[model samples]
Target: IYSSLSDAFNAFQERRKQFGLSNPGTIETIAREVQRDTLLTNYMFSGLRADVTKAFSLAPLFQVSHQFAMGERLNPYAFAALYGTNQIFAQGNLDNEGALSTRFNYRWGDRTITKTQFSIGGGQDMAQFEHEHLGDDFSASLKAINPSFLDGGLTGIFVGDYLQAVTPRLGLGLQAVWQRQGLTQGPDTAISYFARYKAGDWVASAQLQAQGALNTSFWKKLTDRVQAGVDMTLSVAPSQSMMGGLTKEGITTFGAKYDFRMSTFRAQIDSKGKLSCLLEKRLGAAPVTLTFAADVDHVTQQAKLGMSVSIEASDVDLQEQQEGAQSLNIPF
Candidate 1:
């Protein structure tokens, strides 16, 4: 034992750090990044589009993009500003349609944060407040959405979740959600379970959802430039009401992503007879990018095709700093 109390406390802190208790990201996103990014679902569209962007500053991440579209989508004309430091982060997004969304986060000391999210316009408005506490081997979050005083009694949605690392590679979590519409209506509550396992080159996750369904997903790094994801969802009861979803069978999805020297490709196939793919190619040493997207639905004999181009320009100082950083190689 150390003679000084300060030395003893410092040694204990070092020991906890040495245990390497990693943060288990929010349960909602346990295995979402792999499937969402690899599937190309979010990146695909129909018809034609173009984007031109300019960056005036890099340190605070101030940038604006002019978006144009042909065919189905509207001209998005969006603006974004991002500023972050070790203790605080603030970001905002707005479009020409008078819609705005923003987030502000403040870190309390080393292991706790308070966050606020607000969005308005497009016929919708929402406000969310969240707080998270991080321990040496555990993380907990509590959130409330759209809390309103107009209602006679308490009204809003409440959520709480906690994840704890049992060992080095396996973690388990539980999430509970409560919804209250008004004073008269009975509040509804649901509990979900989550688990994650990370191995050398692969990770697997399972989520028992509030809808009485189980979702399992897997991710594997096939190579330095290739990765794959698989997801399956099964439900005990019919997934949809008789008048709607019309399907009770489980769905499985397979997706892959490939990164080339100057291009990236993503493709996905689902058991529900849907196939989609997207490719983005960047011109060498230029800020120009070309994109192509296509999808087919064999169930109803429908298809869509899309093409887009994007160009970016940055300030001289920002451009120079980017090039300098790219040329320097720092090893871990």
Candidate 2:
């Protein structure tokens, strides 16, 4: 949904090649082919919420984590645990793919906070560190991303971002990134500027990049359950600097999403005449849920249909507590 139409078309074309969905005799033909392909299932369970009393000078903050799993390919089993306190918060995730990541945030002083994350698994190790300072009218953050943490080298990218609120409805932002190319290659620098405005049900944002690109987006709420937005990007050739004429290369996209009681529908089209739409729905009752999905790519003339069922279970203690309450309340 965020890419150009040609890219989307090529992606679908490649998928059809991989799955052999290029030719079909009829609806049944497509259906049979989909059924023969791999099917994935998922399960989810949530643990009981336990609160941390004021014993640690923390407010009545509760903790709960969701456990879920997919068919053994990707995240066969994964779960996230989170804890929040007065000035600190932390979350950790472990997945069946042998990946583990954790993030911890701490507020050191009045207007400053720091966050750190580390992950290692599946032949890759990564770490990130970020610090932010917030003032009454402005905020700034510095971030570092290390892709090869296990190598013990400072070969990564660094970024800094700053935002200021000019008024209640207007804001400005700027970002800079320093990329470490290589030992011999000079580091590259990229900077971007952004401005945003919000009024009533309409919001607009514009961004300019030092690499000769400009992007603007506008969003509006036509109704309580309907949203529409348009995004436009313009990139000029380096020879034709922004100050000069327009040998521009860019794309404009228009999209909308509608929310229904039991489903959501999204449709979008890009300047290259490619269109796509997605439909997602939930069926059946609680505890056990059924889902249906459909996606169509008009440019590539490809469509995908999928259905899945998920079961949600609670912790043993929570079940026991419900049973105990039912047993104690005997009278009318």
Candidate 3:
């Protein structure tokens, strides 16, 4: 349902062999593989991946400068939507940011009658981010990634009766979403809601949302060992905004976060290009098996701020400068 509810499937492969490590940097020698098949299906669950790598890591320089959006979920269940994002960090250009949302319910016996829906979607960069320059290491920040500025109409959203399942350990749910987001620097709209609790291996979620004009967001999550989230948004731009150079002028943020995991490696702090930590290994147990993945990110920003920005964007850089990799952040 929610992207296959965590049976958690993972796939990462890497290969790299370089020599010369006395302290001049370049010992990178690796080969890794991993597999955790799919697990879950009452209504839905899905996982997908194809990997190739080569070393000196950083997830293809922050996915070639951030922000690319494409979303879809539709059927006889009722749906129609158009969406887009990114207005800063690189500044290429993307607009229209659309949506028309819907959901109607029926549970028959226990308690869930129906009317669970109301939807509206407008467009723009949905602002939220940090570091205007914390002592510069690469000013102009955020390479090339930009798109989204709104042009259409029809913005409304409501989700009813909420939800709760009660016993599968314990359950609870609630939802609310509203949009007014018409832009030219301030039309702003928002309604936010969420509450959740589940027993067993522990599950908890919290979300408080707002957008445009004053932009706001509070998000939280905890699911097994270590999972994290942090979002803060405040954006206003328009003296004359609608791309041309982007950054219409309005920014606010107060952010803090933490990350950690063990059994290979994992780490993040400060974040840039931001892969910070990932280490894995599995060797020769199966029929010619070997698995490995190592990652890192340090792109400081410099292509043009993007969102639907692909002039020809989307790259893997020859699967890590020519395979034998350990994660150059494969876009290949």
Candidate 4:
């Protein structure tokens, strides 16, 4: 709450003294001080359905995560500016599958910001088969013998700067990524493109570098924490690699969402959006800081498509609280 020059300067000087800084090291030392700083609890979870059409088969997925810092200088002010966050997470599913990722981001001045991330993980190759004309059938021997057909591989990533608020109330962001899939035998390498924008209370973002798919989002809020929005993604039926070839099959999806918060609790309802709606709760208590949630997600492209249901509970240890009562992670 202290925005005065003397107050901000005093806080900076106090930190410098605590970290034992002499001159220019004050700032640089402050940077290093942050490496071991226990700030906020880092947590995340995701579960969804992969629509099956002609190429990729259907699979239900789930994940859990946590992150911690090993060094101080690794985090900088420009790096953890207002609304900044950086962490790593390991995520997997109920089935034999999972992934691990490290992501860093900065959101400052509403106009300048950047984010980068990398992920690697997959699942064993095995699933039942069903055909419209051939009828339902399970691969009794093939599922056990065809380990080579399963989808598992190493994935690589790269991200660049994103300049938001290019103008007064309008902003634009761009992203580039390259991925290599060394599965038993599937994709080799793929390139992708992504872009995002924030204007006034309206937001729109899309990713279209690859030929397989295109995604777009539009949003406007009725209140500070409560808003209404829609996300749509259109992709080829079997579009996997733009470099490989292009297909004609098309799948489109449209959904709606409302997010709201009160004190220590945050809730979201998504329907006709991702398939299932959701509700969530968070406790202000310590030690066992807890969060509870439930939701249903779509399994197909249409509002009429099939769906997957789920319920989950998460308990995050207050790592920042353990480090020091005054410690806090960067704003998020």
Candidate 5:
């Protein structure tokens, strides 16, 4: 039903454009342009390696998706799309379900933006709202999620975050979350503190969560093509009677990446005895582009192979459309 509605609207716009009636008016213009600028389609697949997973027979999971941005060529205001399962060769009873979603974004002045998103199907339905502000040395954002918006209730989770730059290379931030069942009572709250530093090719950050966990990450660029990073997390809960004393667990992970002209490679290993690798490569050129990715897991003995093909409009025209056009909505 949703896609049908989109098709009807698109047909209407095409007729108007061919007859030179008028520019896609406000809402239609944004939708049409966003659609034009977004990815046309995507295909994905995932499966366990037959040798490693010890499965007598295995079939890969598959999915296909398409998206369209709504609005004019450059000034799009919204996006909508559908993704569905494409795997029919599996052994068990097959059920076909698809996911649909849409998002709208608007900017106010030079410092603030608001975004709204709605999605449904695949056993979940949700609506989310986000507002953000950027200043010379500070930034803040608020996000709220209503998991069952279609149910007509405001019970949800709300999160707010703020960050300030203390210097050119150091920063401090905080995040707070509220969980509420309804508007009648006080909500549960959680807060976290954040600190970060970056200098040259090295960057690091640490976060401490109230009654939750402590996490830290350090990243460095070895060269133009190679980068490495480490991440660690520690539990911060208090001691329990069953175990005798305080319970603490520290987890760590290391990862690296290498980028080439047309391909990129990444690998990571965590304290949980899991190791994974991903490789992505670009196939051809121009508007028609093909990309492939392969993922492997050592601990789970599973692997996934996937590919995506998309039609991208030449950005040469996109650039020309912006020349001397200050009114164009370009992100800084």
Candidate 6:
């Protein structure tokens, strides 16, 4: 038996750590797996595209790719190059219109990471900087966008978030955002709270946003090859002077994914009468991939269709590097 409260508390913490605790992913990415993997929303597009890539190495990955697109896009031709090493990742893209986009990620130590992004050449210029720290059972990040020190005061957005695992299956987090336009304007601040729960085959999360919005999401694995997910968002319209009382709006999306030996299929439908699907298939032993995407809005009686092909060529066999491709150690 423990004689002091501090001793008992320390013992309890030790027990919790021994539960084989895993780090809770960053709050911003809690739903990334379901939203990006088990759903078609991210892959849905409206046009014809072709991607060609050639890899020079794999250990310290280096590659170059060309993208050609038609319809519904500002840029029809773009070329990209990427290099990734154990400590850094760098990528750059140049479009036909001379627009350039670059991203850099550097990991200084086991727990610290920094990311920088910049895009220019269009009428608009944008840049962002972020720093992240990974703890044993927690993740935190700080970020700034379009920050300018010469404006007498900061003129940009600053964001910070922290998430920690409360238990093996539960994560709690909060996000704070500060927006400042210029030295003459007042700064705006908001905070959001989020929580995540994970089970053997299911994960659920909810967020109460600062701007008076609530969103919830759930993902479940139905079978080895099948998974399902649902997301719902509800919010009240900001009060408009002289415009009838506040109104509430909500949308819900249900999606599912199926994985085949060489093909992956995803389909989704939302409360707004929208249906979309994406299918990606890799032909037998070839380095070619085919993608088909379609989106239909039943209410608006509109539809969008897209098709794409991706081809890859490399000098050396990448099997060895591929075997240990997952260095991030993210379970999901």
Q: Which numbered prediction scores highest in TM-score against the true structure?
A: 6
By lDDT, the best candidate is 6
| Candidate 2 residue-pair clash tally | 0
lDDT of each: 0.67, 0.51, 0.25, 0.30, 0.49, 0.70
Q: What lDDT tens digits, residue by residue, belong to model 1 across residues 222-323?
A: 888987888888776543455665445677888888879889888888656787788889989877788888777889878777777776665685666576
Per-residue accuracy of model 6 over 1-332 as CA lDDT, tens digit each: 54678787677668767645866447767767567763335645454443333323445366566666555444556666666666566677677655554333333433467777766655567777878867667777888888777534568888888888876887788888877887877677788888888765678888888876888888887788988888887888757678866768888888888889888888888756788888889878776778888788889898877787776664454565577576843211
RMSD of each: 5.4, 18.7, 24.8, 19.6, 17.3, 4.1
Task: Predict model 2's lDDT versus the native.
Answer: 0.51
lDDT of 2 by residue, 16-116 (tens): 44433222111111221211111111111111111111111112232344444443324534555555445556556566565553333323332356766
Among all windows of ten consecutive residues in candidate 3, which has the lowest summed lDDT?
Answer: 26-35
Looking at model 5, residue 111 earns an lDDT score of 38
Native-to-model Cα distance after best TM-score fit, residue 149 in candidate 3, in Å: 8.4
- TM values, all candidates: 0.78, 0.59, 0.19, 0.37, 0.58, 0.84
Give me candidate 2's TM-score against the actual structure. 0.59
Cα lDDT tens digits, model 3, 85-173, are 12111112222333433222211111211111112334322232211211111111111112223456433222221333333332233
Provide backbone clash counts, one per model.
0, 0, 47, 12, 13, 0
lDDT of 2 at 126: 65
Off by over 4 Å in 4: 1-166, 171-173, 179-195, 237-274, 283-332
Candidates ranked by TM-score:
6, 1, 2, 5, 4, 3
Candidate 1, superposed: residue stretches over 4 Å from native: 1-20, 39-60, 69-73, 97-111, 150-152, 236-247, 323-332
- For residue 315, give model 6's deviation from the true position in Å: 3.5
Model 1: weakest 10-residue lDDT segment is 323-332
